[PDB]
Amino acid sequence: GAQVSSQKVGAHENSSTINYTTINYYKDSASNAASKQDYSQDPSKFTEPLKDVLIKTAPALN
């Protein structure tokens, strides 16, 4: 049940993919730590919530 993932390495020693290991010890998922491997999204629903979305090179009002 060990999950092995890659670390995003910042400073490098003068010594490659370094991995880390996680095992969940509890049945309830609320006990789990955060994996912090989080995806993102498009801001459009806030920055461009327009019915006809127009291209930035074209006039906004036609």
Binding site: G1, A2, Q3, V4, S5, S6, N19, T21
Partner: peptide, 4 residues
């Protein structure tokens, strides 16, 4: 185990 499961590497990702």
């Amino acid at each position: 185990i499961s590497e990702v």
